[PDB]
């Protein structure tokens, strides 16, 4: 795995010693090269995970996420070039280093074999994210958003730390392989119930769950474009990955303890999508759509059926790409109009046609237009829930309807109607912005061709 | 359009009702001859109370006529195709591109239409030169507590253009295509 | 009706508007940025049957050749790929194994 980790580390000295005119260029080049190298990990075995060493391993769950992170870094740099263009060289290098550190941490999280190592790194991801949000945010709510995000995540994580150490003391090892081979069923004792809660709540906080999702709107809206990209593309999937890993030692208590969270998420998807319907901020709308799409994954993980897990992995990858793209488009519009009010800018389709096409394709992916991987994951989760209970189809179909409604509503309000007259600073789309949108869309549509790669280890 | 007024006079309100009533009657009477026959009958009804002088009585009659209009309102009245509510209303709105986008054209694109953009520069200069007088003129003709009506004054002296004229003059054509 | 100031302003605005509309008129030429690909190849190449047939070839002959060739990699290679409904047998003779059968008949009263 060091074939990916070591170059990622070597990015930092390069960025620090790169010329002020070559910082972005060098970073983008070598980040793309690192993504190319990470592509090799997709060759997962049929049964055994790719155990590179005692500390790092990968499976058909970890590899897509690793590729996603290594691919997301260059696009984040490209997006960050615009607003961080009047910054001093040292601070620009600092931002690049924060992004690189975040990518390195995420790689190690997705490859860590030891559960406590995963906890350490997955909670280490907070520091770069917090710094990015609080320092390079544009509004005054950035400080409160960072506080909310950090405190939510820590309040979830600390009981998880206690529980993990308890497991290490009792079982003797926290290695995923040993934990899976030496799995022992949990009883219904209150101690086991609280252990299950401690092991689940942290990941429930990580991937916004209705009731504990209050941090996400603030974080996504206040954070800079790159920060929002990671927040909505990988940092949320951290919760899903950790939950799928930790559910191995949380059975059969999951059957009894899932009902609260299952109902919370099944109603939360509807609630959040309805909230999207009546939103005035573009980034807030995108964030709430993310909340709903992640609630789908939460349901899938809780049900613990093989189809559910496959759909969960596919949905995670698809949502990462789509949400990052949506935030990038909103960022371009925001940079041009210097406001996040959705109704402020209207009829942008006339002024910017190609960006409007990008908007259309992104919204289509958001509403899970067949045969996009978004639809593949959503349909798999829907079928798994239908097997769990036939009544689920009601809420699932209603959520699909509301998602389509609010996505098309966003497209109509922004990229349709009479153009706003006073807004005269809408210049033609830059090549960089179009390239960013293309590098978000094309991989997803290509992934639809060979979904087996992103269908998880249960394929 | 034209500058709005604070209120509508009773005479104005009756005239508005008259046009609406005839149009709805025309919607009811598909055949032209049928409409013309009943149009005069309706016109006579307005003529019958044309002499009516008592404002309270006239206002009472106006209320009754509007109530009658609502009861006899055509559920699907004819609306002109390009009129608000028409089938072709706002149809070509998307094709209407603001002129300021032309300044963002690449030099190659501006080279495709050199004469036009050259004349466009002349229009730009005209706007800037007259702008200062436009604001100054508005202040001179502005009442103490600001404008009470949205009506704008014309060019009092030669060499000046009507204040706030650029958008009205350079507005998009009905059919850009 | 129109107040004198309003009417005068309308007149002035109309004058300027009409000037703007006249300005919005293409010049005698619209310089077109400078066709080596369409030189000798498109000098005086056949404009009736060659054009119709080349469109026909590129749009059907090449695709049909490619698809019929893909049959060689698809139906002959993988089993149960192109499943044809068993041909309806009406009392008669087959091909591979021949053989014939014929049922009884009822009285035929009229046409």
């Amino acid at each position: 795995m060091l074939k990916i980790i070591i170059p990622t580390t070597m990015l930092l000295p390069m960025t620090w010693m790169s010329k002020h005119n070559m910082i972005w260029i060098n970073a983008t080049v070598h980040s793309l090269l690192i993504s190319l190298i990470s592509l090799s990990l997709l060759n997962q075995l049929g049964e055994n995970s790719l155990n590179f060493s005692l500390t790092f391993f990968s499976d058909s769950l970890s590899a897509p996420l690793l590729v996603l992170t290594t691919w997301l870094l260059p696009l984040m740099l490209m997006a960050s070039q615009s607003h961080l263009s009047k910054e001093t060289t040292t601070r620009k290098k600092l931002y690049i280093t924060m992004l690189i550190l975040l990518q390195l941490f995420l790689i190690m999280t997705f490859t860590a074999t030891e559960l406590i190592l995963f906890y350490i790194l997955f909670e280490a991801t907070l520091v770069p994210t917090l710094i990015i949000i609080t320092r390079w945010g544009n509004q005054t709510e950035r400080l409160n958003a960072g506080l909310y995000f950090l405190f939510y995540t820590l309040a979830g994580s600390l009981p998880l730390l206690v529980a993990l150490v308890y497991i290490q003391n009792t079982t003797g090892s926290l290695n995923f392989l040993i934990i899976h081979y030496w799995s022992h069923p949990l009883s219904n004792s209150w101690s086991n119930i609280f252990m299950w809660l401690a092991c689940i709540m942290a990941f429930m906080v990580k991937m916004p769950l209705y009731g504990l999702h209050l941090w996400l709107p603030k974080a996504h809206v206040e954070a800079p474009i790159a920060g929002s990209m990671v927040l909505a593309a990988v940092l949320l999937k951290l919760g899903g990955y950790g939950m799928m890993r930790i559910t191995t030692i949380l059975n059969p208590l999951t059957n009894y303890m899932a009902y609260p969270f299952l109902m919370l998420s099944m109603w939360g998807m509807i609630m959040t999508s309805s909230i999207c319907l009546r939103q005035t901020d573009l980034k807030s709308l995108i964030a709430y759509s993310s909340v709903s799409h992640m609630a789908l994954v939460i349901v899938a993980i809780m049900i613990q059926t093989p189809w559910s897990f496959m759909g969960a992995t596919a949905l995670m990858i698809a949502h990462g790409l789509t949400s990052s793209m949506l935030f990038c488009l909103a960022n371009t519009n925001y940079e041009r109009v210097h406001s996040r009010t959705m109704i402020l800018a209207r009829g942008l389709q006339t002024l910017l046609p190609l960006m409007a096409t990008w908007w259309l394709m992104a919204s289509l992916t958001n509403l899970a237009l067949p045969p996009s991987i978004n639809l593949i994951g959503e349909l798999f989760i829907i079928t798994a829930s239908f097997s769990w209970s036939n009544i689920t189809i009601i809420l699932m179909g209603m959520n699909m309807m509301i998602t389509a409604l609010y996505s098309l509503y966003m497209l109509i309000t922004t990229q349709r109607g009479k153009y706003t007259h006073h807004i005269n600073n809408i210049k033609a789309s830059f090549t960089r912005e179009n390239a960013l949108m293309a590098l978000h869309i094309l991989p997803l549509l290509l992934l639809t061709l060979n979904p087996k790669m992103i269908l998880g280890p249960l394929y | 359009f034209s500058a709005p007024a604070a209120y509508l006079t009773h005479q104005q309100k009756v005239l508005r009702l008259y046009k609406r009533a005839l149009r709805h009657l025309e919607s009811w009477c598909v055949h032209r001859d049928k409409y013309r026959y009943f149009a005069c009958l309706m016109r006579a009804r307005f003529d019958e109370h044309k002499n009516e002088k008592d404002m309270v009585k006239a206002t009472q009659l106006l209320r009754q006529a509007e109530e009658e209009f609502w009861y006899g309102q055509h559920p699907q009245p004819y609306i002109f195709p390009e009129s608000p509510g028409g089938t072709s209303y706002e149809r070509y709105e998307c094709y209407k591109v603001p002129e300021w986008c032309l300044d963002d054209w690449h030099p190659s694109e501006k080279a495709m239409y050199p004469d036009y953009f050259a004349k466009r520069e002349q229009w730009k200069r005209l706007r800037r030169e007259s702008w200062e007088r436009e604001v100054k003129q508005l202040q001179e003709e502005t009442p103490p507590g600001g404008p009470r009506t949205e009506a704008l004054p014309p060019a009092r002296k030669e060499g000046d253009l009507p204040p706030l004229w650029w958008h009205i003059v350079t507005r998009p054509r009905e059919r850009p295509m | 009706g129109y107040t004198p100031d309003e009417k005068l302003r309308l007149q002035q605005l109309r004058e300027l508007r009409r000037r703007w509309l006249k300005d919005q008129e293409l010049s005698p030429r619209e310089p077109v940025l400078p066709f080596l690909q369409d030189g000798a190849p498109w000098k005086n190449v056949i404009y009736k049957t060659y054009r119709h047939s080349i469109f026909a070839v590129t749009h059907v002959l090449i695709p049909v050749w490619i698809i019929h060739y893909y049959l060689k990699y698809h139906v002959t290679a993988k089993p149960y790929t192109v499943v044809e409904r068993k041909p309806r047998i009406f009392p008669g003779d087959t091909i591979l194994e021949t053989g014939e059968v014929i049922p009884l008949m009822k009285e035929f009263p009229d046409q």
């Binding site: 033609a428 | 603001p98 986008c101 032309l102 963002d104 036009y116 | 919005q24 008129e25």
Partner: peptide, 12 residues
């Protein structure tokens, strides 16, 4: 009469 059609810049 050939009239200039105001359009967004399409070169980019």
């Amino acid at each position: 009469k050939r009239l200039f059609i105001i359009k967004p810049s399409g070169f980019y």
